[PDB]
């Protein structure tokens, strides 16, 4: 399963 | 033995020709199980292994929604990096992301990963402790400070130890027939004359799983590393792997040479000779 998280560089 | 789950993401900008290309691939050890392609019609995470095909709509919709969010973050990320490096809009650039977890023979957490590349060079990477970052360059320092202040690493440690290990274990269980198998190599040797006084002896290892293997040549038990031509382990296309190792032997000295095969599928390593 892929991650949920979501963050930007 | 040890096991691993890995997700690989590639985003490539396309100036003057629409949205960037985005490919997601997921692996369990050396077996791929999922894919997402922004250029394919489906617009969904798709099965690439038979043991995940019957997971169901709740699994499938969820993986599609999450992978769609990954595409949008990277779509924005490309704009951010071009800015960070003071680059033109007409150039095609590459962002790569890899994440996953390693478990031991005991099936519990051993190692975590989450790293980025920009145009093939290391950008940022989560350190082994899963609390600190490694920013390879001056431009990467902004991202490093942005994530340190937002405590991003804490949220990343939670996924890599929990969900990643939990789901790796569930795929290992469901795909037991193929993932927990050990296909030992099928071996053979070939002999071809280079000249009138020399010949190549090639040692083959075929149809093996997992990919990890050691193929070596010895003359009277003494190391021949510098004189062995060794090919990169290659996929057969049926889920198994191949490798060969070859030495140039002075004709009439075939009996001095032995090929050694080391693989998880062999309880005792094989010693092969041309005779």
């Amino acid at each position: 399963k892929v991650a949920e998280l979501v963050h930007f560089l | 033995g040890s096991h691993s789950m890995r997700y690989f993401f590639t985003s490539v900008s396309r100036p003057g020709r629409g949205e960037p290309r985005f490919i997601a691939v997921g692996y369990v050890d050396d077996t791929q199980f999922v894919r997402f392609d922004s250029d394919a019609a489906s617009q969904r995470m798709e099965p690439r292994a038979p043991w995940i095909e019957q997971e169901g709509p709740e699994y499938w919709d969820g993986e599609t929604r999450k992978v769609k969010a990954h595409s949008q973050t990277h779509r924005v990320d490309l704009g951010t990096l071009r800015g960070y490096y003071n680059q033109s809009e007409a150039g095609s650039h590459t962002v790569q992301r890899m994440y996953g977890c390693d478990v031991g023979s005991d099936w519990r957490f051993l190692r975590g990963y989450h790293q980025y590349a920009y145009d093939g060079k290391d950008y940022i990477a989560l350190k082994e402790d899963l609390r600190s970052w490694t920013a390879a360059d001056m431009a990467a320092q902004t991202t490093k400070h942005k994530w340190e202040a937002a405590h991003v690493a804490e949220q990343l440690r939670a996924y890599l130890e929990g969900t990643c290990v939990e789901w790796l274990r569930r795929y290992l269980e469901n795909g037991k027939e193929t993932l927990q198998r050990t296909d030992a190599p099928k071996t053979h040797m070939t002999h071809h004359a280079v000249s009138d006084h020399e010949a190549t002896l090639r040692c083959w290892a075929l149809s093996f799983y997992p990919a990890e293997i050691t193929l070596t040549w010895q003359r009277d038990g003494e190391d021949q590393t510098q004189d062995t031509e060794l090919v990169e382990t290659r996929p057969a296309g049926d889920g198994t792997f191949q490798k060969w190792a070859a030495v140039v032997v002075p004709s009439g000295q075939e009996q001095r040479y032995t090929c050694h095969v080391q693989h998880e599928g062999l309880p005792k390593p094989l010693t092969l000779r041309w005779e």
């Binding site: - | 690989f8 490539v12 590459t94 090919v231 990169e232 296309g237």
Partner: protein
């Protein structure tokens, strides 16, 4: 910007036996950037029904792809892999040999 030359391996899935069905493979690896052209040839002519694996990469970030097609090898027929990339001045032609 980073530019890495693809390594090329042309081989069959099963050891080659004339008149018996097989798969002809072209494994491209260690390349950067990701845009690459890979053709499978039969007596110097392009094979139309050619599939490829989903783009993936190693620990060093370099890309790898497997291009494949169903084939029945013969004694007479010549097979090869034609590759084009930014690192290549001209298209690289690698001939298929049953023992490589």
């Amino acid at each position: 910007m980073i530019q890495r030359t693809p390594k090329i391996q042309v081989y069959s899935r099963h050891p080659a036996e004339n008149g018996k069905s097989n798969f002809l493979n072209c494994y491209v690896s260690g390349f950067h950037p990701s845009d690459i052209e890979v053709d499978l040839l039969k007596n110097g002519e392009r094979i139309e029904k050619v599939e490829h694996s989903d783009l993936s990469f190693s620990k060093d970030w370099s890309f790898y792809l497997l291009y494949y097609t169903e084939f029945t090898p013969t004694e007479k027929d010549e097979y090869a892999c034609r590759v084009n990339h930014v690192t290549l001045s001209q298209p690289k032609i690698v001939k298929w040999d049953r023992d490589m």
